[PDB]
Structure 1
Amino acid sequence: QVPTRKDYGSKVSLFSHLPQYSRQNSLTQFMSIPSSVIHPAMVRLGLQYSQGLVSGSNARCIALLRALQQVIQDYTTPPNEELSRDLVNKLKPYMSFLTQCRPLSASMHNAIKFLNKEITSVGSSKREEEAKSELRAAIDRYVQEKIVLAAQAISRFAYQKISNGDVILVYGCSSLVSRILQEAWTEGRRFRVVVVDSRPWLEGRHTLRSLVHAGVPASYLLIPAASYVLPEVSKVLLGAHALLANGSVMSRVGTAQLALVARAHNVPVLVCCETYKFCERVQTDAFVSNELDDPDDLQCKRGEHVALANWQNHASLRLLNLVYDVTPPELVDLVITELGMIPCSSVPVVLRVKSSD
């Protein structure tokens, strides 16, 4: 059986209901080396989630669908049982193990929902390997269109907005915004990018390398220098991880802050999100549902005087590094999807017209 991981450190009194684990210890210390309860591709996926090797919001969904292809390929049918019920009952502890490794992104939630809807609608007269081929082909078509065709459509719809001679501000690491910047630089736009990064992940270095390798002139700075440079910045690109029912933008933790400071400097912000990453779930703060990272990650070496080394010996000391927040929907201007340029109030509209209604 799969046990629960022990909560690490002293939690925030506002975040006592949310789990906070550590990357030092693993859950597979008390599991079999031939993976029998959990699928071996699923425990491989949980290891590359828990150690932080797959951090992008689209990369988690791609690796999730590849592991689901490896599970469905390694699926067998018992006697007098249907695939459309047994696969539903078997994939739930797999997703529970993946949730206990690392909290799921909403892209992965909608991927689980779409796969459950597809394996629910498999007919009883279909054979074993024929339904396996149908499910693998459905996953392949799904990842094919709703990654690369939506990415090309959002790239063209943002290419027809970015003009010549402007400056663009980005935050965090996202493959969609970086692909927009690369395909805007290659097709003829001449611009420079101000890259805003934040602690302790420091994931802005990835898109910094991606913009220098693409030939784009780049500028690198942090959250406090964004207030210094936004009087010169005319355009802000952002990478959204989830869009809610009210039009909120779930992204990295420095998103609503940067959008508020950009509106204070009259700089329009632009989030870029594909339509499968939407939510019928809604929240208004970063407190009722959020991911808790490592409390040992906030420490750094400024000289030889690391102060947060023995932070657990102080009883009145709390360590917190939030992953997700939400934006109020009156702060974000663009929502660039593959259907066209929509505002934030059109997210449940696109949910309705893409939910067969």
Structure 2
Amino acid sequence: GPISEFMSTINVEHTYPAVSSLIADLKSRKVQGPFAVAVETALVMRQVISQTRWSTVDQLIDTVRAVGSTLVKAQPTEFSCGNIIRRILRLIREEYQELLKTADENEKGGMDMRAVIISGIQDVIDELDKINTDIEVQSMDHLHSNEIILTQGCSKTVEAFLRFAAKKRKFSVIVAEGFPNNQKGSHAMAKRLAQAGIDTTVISDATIFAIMSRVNKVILGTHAILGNGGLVTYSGAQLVAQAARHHATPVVVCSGIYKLSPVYPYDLESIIQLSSPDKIMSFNEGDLISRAEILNPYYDYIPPDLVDLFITNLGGYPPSYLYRIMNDTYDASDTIL
């Protein structure tokens, strides 16, 4: 049940324009990354709420769902889209059921709750700029001096996770650049980690198995978490988990909660995305680019039975408890969009 069944593509552009403008920005990867998708997904629905007129609540939850179903097929793999939607849907039917009852409680039809949703939407937006700032503080219960740590590729959440510990504890981290797609940011992170007083070492992606033998913990940042606790993460992370489990090395995941999604990884081949081979082999090698098959995926699936701990804005939680974070944050009716 998408939106085009409700509103004509042209009148959508007049009623809620930013929606139609977002889909373009969403398919063209003008806005990628789960955070940038998340915050922009919210404040788009802000204007939507501030622009739709309606009478009964069942109009909204059927309307806002419909735009979401298209807002997903724009680029579905950027999961943070629906997660902001699915959370909004519960946000209204909670604000509904609380008001429909507190009015019944005032006893011996007022769709003017739009500004409450906006006060509820902006609440979740303000939570996003409060993702790392309340996650970085969990380090001092996990990072300790003289320990050896391994991560992979740029991940500011993990970056801020360590640097907070570096304030008082001195220790060492090991960085595996996320070749080919996380190369740039990963190098930068290590250069920043060095300033904070962290014996940081940059290694090729293939040097992972070698050094893990003397690694205490591995910290990882993901691109999203799926309904089975599995991980969709930027390329080359399974190399770390598989090398970790081979050494009984604990695996820790520092992720926000807006990436936690209930969609179930049915077929992986419809999850991973494939970027341009230009990041792997130069266009000049013309003989090769013709005679061969060149692929550059930039996601990676690691199964849930491989993560030992989840650092979230709500706290540390085993993977076998993620579901209770879902049902306390979403609604099973909104699994599919």
TM-score bin (small chain): 0.7 to 0.9
2:36 equivalent in structure 1? 59
Q: Is the 8 A contact 1:158 1:336 kept in 2?
A: no
User: Is 2:162 the partner of 1:181?
Assistant: yes
Report the Cα offset of residue 223 of structure 1: 2.1
Which of the residues 34, 54, 78 maps onto 1:105? 78
- In the alignment, is the contact (CA less than 8 A) between 1:167 and 1:194 conserved in 2? yes
Matches within 5 A, 1:1-357: 36=13, 39-73=16-50, 75-77=51-53, 81-82=54-55, 84-92=57-65, 94-120=67-93, 122=96, 124-127=109-112, 131-145=113-127, 147-185=128-166, 187-201=167-181, 203-213=182-192, 215-216=195-196, 217=198, 218-283=200-265, 286-287=268-269, 289-301=270-282, 304-307=284-287, 309=289, 311=290, 318-352=293-327
SS in 1 for 2:221: strand
How much has 1:88 moved relative to structure 2?
4.1
| Structure 1: runs of 5 or more not aligned | 4-30
Q: 1:172 to 1:68 in 2, by over 3 A?
A: farther
Task: Give the secondary-structure state (helix, strand or coil) at the position aligned to 1:274.
Answer: coil
The residue number in structure 1 matching 2:334 is none
Contact 1:57 1:174 in 2 (8 A): no
Deviation at 1:292, TM superposition (A): 2.4
Determine the C-alpha separation between the residues in 1 that align with 2:237 and 2:267.
13
What CA distance in whole angstroms lies between the structure 2 residues aligned with 1:38 and 1:159?
A: 49
Deviation at residue 112 of structure 1 after TM alignment: 1.1
SS across alignment from 1:168? strand
Cα separation, partners in 2 of 1:340 and 1:114, compared to 1, 3 Å: closer
Q: Would the aligned equivalents of 2:222 and 2:231 in 1 still touch at CA under 8 Å? A: yes
Relative to 1, partners in 2 of residues 1:142 and 1:47: Cα closer, same or farther, differing over 3 Å? same
- Secondary structure of the equivalent of 2:13? coil
Q: 1:354 to 1:50 in 2, by over 3 A?
A: closer
Distance in 2 of aligned mates of 1:221 and 1:51 = 33
On the 8 A contact 2:86/2:330 being kept in 1, the answer is no
Q: Provide closer, same or farther for how the CA distance between residues 267 and 306 of structure 1 changes in structure 2, counting only shifts above 3 A.
A: farther
Taking only the aligned residue pairs, the percentage that are identical comes to 24
Are the counterparts in 2 of residues 298 and 319 from structure 1 also a CA contact under 8 Å? no
User: What is the CA deviation profile of residues 295-352 of structure 1, one whole-angstrom value per residue up to 9, with x for unaligned ones?
Assistant: 55455328x425554x4xx6xx655443444323332211223443322222124334
In the other structure, the counterpart of 1:24 is none
Contact 2:27 2:75 in 1 (8 A): yes
Counterparts of 1:100 and 1:91, CA distance in 2: 15
In structure 2, C-alpha distance between the alignment counterparts of 1:126 and 1:53, rounded to whole Å: 35
Q: CA deviation at 1:149?
A: 4.5
CA contact (8 A) 1:256 1:327 kept: yes
- Judged with a 3 Å threshold, the aligned counterparts in structure 2 of structure 1 residues 66 and 172 are, in CA distance, closer, same or farther, namely farther
Distance 1:308 1:43 in 2: 41
Report how far residue 116 of structure 1 moved: 2.1
Q: Deviations over 1:43-96 (max 9, x none)?
A: 4433443444443322321221122223333x042xxx4263444454456435
For the Cα contact (< 8 Å) 1:269–1:334, is it kept in 2?
Answer: yes
Q: CA RMSD in A?
A: 3.5
Change (3 A) 1:285 1:231: farther
Counterpart Cα distance in 2 of 1:140 and 1:42? 18
Q: Check conservation: 1:284, 1:328, Cα contact below 8 A.
A: no
Q: Is there any run of 5+ residues in structure 2 with no aligned partner, and where? A: 101-108, 332-337
Q: What letter is aligned with 2:161? A: I
Give the Cα–Cα distance (whole angstroms) in 2 for the partners of residues 245 and 76 of structure 1: 32
- Once residues 221 and 44 of structure 1 are traced to their aligned partners in structure 2, the CA distance between those partners, rounded to angstroms, is 41
Task: For 1:233, give the aligned amino acid.
Answer: V
Q: State the AA in 1 paired with 2:217.
A: K
In proportion to residue count, which structure has more helix?
2
CA distance in 2, matches of 1:321, 1:94: 32
Residue aligned with 1:151, SS: coil
How many residue pairs get matched? 311
After superposition, give the CA deviation of every residue in 1:176-230 in whole Å (9 maximum; x if it has no partner).
2122123222x312234322233442x2432542453462454333321222332
SS in 2 for 1:237: strand
Cα pair 1:286 1:325 within 8 Å, conserved: no
